[PDB]
Amino acid sequence: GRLDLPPGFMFKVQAQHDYTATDTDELQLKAGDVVLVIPFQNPEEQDEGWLMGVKESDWNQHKKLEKCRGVFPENFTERVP
Amino acid sequence: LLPTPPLSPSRRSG
């Protein structure tokens, strides 16, 4: 995996459903997935009901997180303390 | 029973 953590990061979340997202900057979630809430490049980009988060696997790709970034429905996931 | 949200736009991060 990576070595350093993502800056701005907030916390980790867990999906509760399987939502296949196929976009140029989407975030695929699978019922029981792990995602990290990170601060997007702007609130104007943030979608209504969806926020900018990264999957655990993407974390390992922190090297290219800029290309691992995506959007996911928060109302479809769960926050992890 | 989490209700699935509506289709979101192409959120191109940069």
Closest CA to B14 of A9, A42, A7: A42
Which domain, by its residues, includes A55?
Answer: 1-81
8 A C-beta contact, residue A29 and residue A13: no
- In CATH, what number is assigned to the domain containing residue A57? 2.30.30.40
Which residue in the set B8, B12, B14 is minimally distant from A50, CB to CB?
Answer: B8
What is the domain count for chain A? 1
Interface check B4 vs A, CB under 8 A: yes
Buried b (16+ CB within 10 A) or exposed e, A18-44: ebebeeebbbbbeeebbbbbbebeeee
Cβ distance of B2 and A17 shorter than 8 Å: yes
User: What's the alpha-carbon Rg for chain B, to the nearest Å?
Assistant: 11
For A75, the 3-state DSSP assignment is helix
Give, in order, the Cα–Cα distances in Å from A28 to each of A3, A4, A31, A32. 23, 23, 10, 12
